Amino acid sequence: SHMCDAFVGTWKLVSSENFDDYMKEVGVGFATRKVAGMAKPNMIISVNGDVITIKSESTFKNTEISFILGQEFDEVTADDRKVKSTITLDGGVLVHVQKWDGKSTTIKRKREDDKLVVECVMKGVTSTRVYERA
Numbered sequence: 001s002h003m004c005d006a007f008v009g010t011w012k013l014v015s016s017e018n019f020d021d022y023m024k025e026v027g028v029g030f031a032t033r034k035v036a037g038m039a040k041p042n043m044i045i046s047v048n049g050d051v052i053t054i055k056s057e058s059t060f061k062n063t064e065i066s067f068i069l070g071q072e073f074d075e076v077t078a079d080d081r082k083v084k085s086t087i088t089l090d091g092g093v094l095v096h097v098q099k100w101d102g103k104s105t106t107i108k109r110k111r112e113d114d115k116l117v118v119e120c121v122m123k124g125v126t127s128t129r130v131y132e133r134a
C-alpha cells in the first residue's frame with residue numbers, strides 16, 4: 001500500500017461553489033465558463049509505480065495528466081492554458097500548482113470522510129468542488 005491509496009478510484013462531481021468566479025479570476029472567457037461550469041466530470045485517479053495519472057472526463061472536455069510527485073511537467077488545461085505544473089503530497093493533501101504568464105493557481109485534493117474535496121485558489125478567490133465515489 002502506498003502514497004495515494006485513498007485517492008485511487010473513479011470519482012464523480014456532486015457539488016460546486018464559486019467555480020464561475022474562480023474561472024473568471026483565472027482568465028477563462030465567457031463561453032468556456034458557461035459550458036465548463038455545466039460539466040459534471042468524472043475524476044479517475046490511478047497509480048502505477050511512481051507515476052500518478054489523473055483523468056477528468058465530461059461532456060465538455062476529456063483531460064489526462066500523468067506525473068511523478070515533485071517533478072514539473074507541462075500541462076494543457078481544459079481552457080487551453082499552457083501551464084507548467086508541479087504536484088506534491090503535503091500532509092496527505094495532493095497540492096497542484098500551475099504557473100503561466102507570471103500567474104499561479106493552486107488546486108488541492110484531500111480525502112474527507114467518503115469524499116474527495118477539491119479546493120481551487122486563484123488570488124483571493126477559492127472554489128470548492130466535492131466529489132463522491134462513482
Ligand SMILES: C[C@H]1[C@H]2C[C@@H]([C@@H]1C(=O)O)[C@@H]1C(c3ccc(Cl)cc3)=NO[C@H]21
Binds near residue numbers: 077
Ligand atoms: C479537479 C478540478 C480542478 C481541475 C478541474 C477539475 C474540475 O472539477 O473540473 C478544475 C479546473 C478547470 C479550469 C478551467 C476549466 Cl474550463 C475547467 C476546469 N480548474 O481547477 C479544477
